[PDB]
Structures are given as C-alpha cells and as structure tokens.
C-alpha cells in the first residue's frame, strides 16, 4: 500500500509527540526530586567511599544540571514502554507476518530484561565494583568523585547491562524460531569477537576503555547465549 511522504511524516510526527509528551510529563513530575533521585543513584558509591572522602562538583553548572540530566534520562527509561509502543505502531504495517512473530517477542522481552539490567547492576554490581574501585587508589590519593563523571559512569554501566542482558534471550529466541542454530553460532565466534570491538568502537568515544567496557559484555554474554541454545 503506497502512500505519499507526508502521510508517513504526519504519522511519525504524531508518534513523536506522544513520546515527547510522555517524557516531559514524567520529567515534570520528577524534576522536583532531582537531588533526591541523585542520592539514590549515588548511594552505592557513598557507602563504599573511604573515610574522609566525599563527592565533589568540578563544574559550575554541575550541582544543578547533573541531577537535572539524571532525572531526564530516568524519564526516558520510565517512558520506554510508551516510546516502544509508538515505535511498534509506526513499524507495524512494514513488518510481514513472519517478521511480526519475532519482533513482538523481542520488544516485550527487551523491555523487561533492560530493566532487570539496572536492577542487577544497581543491587549487585554497583556495591561490588564501588567497594573495590574506591578502595584501590594509590597511597596519598584522595578519592574525590566528580558528580558529572559518576553520572556518565553509572549510565555507561546501566546501558551496558540492559542491552547485554537481552543478548542471550535474543540468541535463544533466534534458535527457537530456527533463524540460527547453535552449530552456526560456534563457527561465527571469531567474527563476533572482532564485531564486538567494531560495535564498541562506533557507539563509544574514541577511548579504548569505553570500547572494551562495552564489547566484553556483548561477547561474553553472547557465549552464554550459545550455551543455553544447547538446552532448547
């Protein structure tokens, strides 16, 4: 069913507005608690900071705009079900019946696993990592964590865990529908390892640290996904 370009842009504008309205309304209901929301996010770090160590703000606008930046992305995460539905409704006529049987399970399962990524990272990984990182400084070095740097690190881990949690289930689903077999995944192992570094390079700043902090979660959790593909 061919349609004029404006028809697709009319629909896209309507769906984009519903995404912006959802984010703004959630942001307005949450912007008043920006400092309280930052206390929750920085709670794992504060509990593990050494005696005499406290968080600092090295930027003039950081004390205000870093909590504001945090509650904005919290709004984006909380509005993901609305955003994903608008994405689904825009791409629903494009998908065929056979492609509909795969995208719908992916969209629903991604949302839950992406939240379990934060729950696992916040309640398990953050206490373990912060208790080690904050107490491994060289002698004479005072751990004074910048609030702007901490927010970037936390969202880097939250995005990494949420995305990488979906990889094993996506692999198992692809094995279930028959798109890919465990045998074919084992012979594509060298390419995924190189491909993981390529994906990490593109989606991260040119620092190698950000490349490896992302690529290793994909390739490792790719390997676990192949393991459960046997039990299916």
């Amino acid at each position: 069913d061919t349609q004029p370009l404006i028809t697709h842009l009319i629909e896209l504008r309507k769906r984009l507005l519903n995404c912006i309205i959802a984010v703004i309304v959630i942001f307005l209901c949450l912007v008043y608690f920006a400092n309280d929301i930052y206390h929750l996010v920085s709670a794992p770090l504060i509990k593990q900071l050494p005696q005499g160590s406290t968080m600092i703000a090295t930027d003039v606008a950081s004390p205000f705009f870093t909590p504001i930046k945090l509650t904005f992305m919290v709004s984006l995460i909380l509005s993901a079900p609305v955003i994903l539905y608008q994405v689904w409704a825009f791409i629903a006529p494009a998908l065929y019946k056979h492609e509909r049987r795969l995208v719908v399970p992916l969209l629903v399962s991604s949302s839950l696993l992406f939240y379990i990524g934060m729950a696992f990272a916040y309640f398990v990984v953050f206490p373990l990592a912060f208790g080690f990182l904050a107490n491994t400084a060289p002698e004479g070095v005072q751990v004074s964590t910048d609030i702007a740097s901490y927010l970037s690190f936390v969202m880097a881990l939250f995005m990494a865990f949420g995305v990488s949690f979906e990889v094993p289930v996506a692999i198992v689903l692809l094995c279930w529908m028959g798109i890919t077999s465990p045998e074919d995944l084992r012979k594509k192992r060298p390419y995924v390892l190189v491909g993981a570094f390529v994906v990490g390079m593109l989606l991260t700043p040119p620092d190698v640290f950000s490349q490896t902090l992302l690529a290793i979660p994909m390739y490792c959790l790719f390997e676990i996904g192949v393991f459960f593909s046997r039990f299916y």
Binding site: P4, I6, P190, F197, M201, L203
Partner: protein
C-alpha cells in the same frame, strides 16, 4: 557521526588479524565494504524518490 579513534581502529585490525587470520580478514573487510556500499546505494535511491515526491507535492499544492 560515529567517533572513531586511531587506537580503536588499530585494535580492531590487530585483533582481526590474530583471530580471523590472513585468509579470513581480507574477506571480512571486503564483506563490510559491500555493506557500506549497499547502505549508500540505498540512501541515494531513497533520496531520489523523496525528491521526486516533493516535486509532485509542489505540483498538487500549487494548483490547490
């Protein structure tokens, strides 16, 4: 635009050479080049279609 560093690119080729090997890395780069070639070919033909539709919209809008 994606931010690509020289160190990041060298690591990819270094890892690709030691993992894929002398016989699979050139084919992998050739395959990736074809993907980018097809991506730009698809981008060009769609932009041509959008330009042709915009002219049709102007013809309809001008009359009405």
């Amino acid at each position: 635009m994606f931010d690509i560093g020289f160190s990041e690119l060298l690591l990819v080729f270094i890892i690709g050479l030691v993992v894929l090997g002398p016989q699979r890395l050139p084919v992998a780069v050739k395959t990736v080049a074809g993907w980018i070639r097809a991506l730009r070919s698809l981008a060009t033909t769609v932009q041509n279609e959008l330009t042709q539709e915009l002219k049709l919209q102007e013809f309809q809008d001008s009359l009405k």
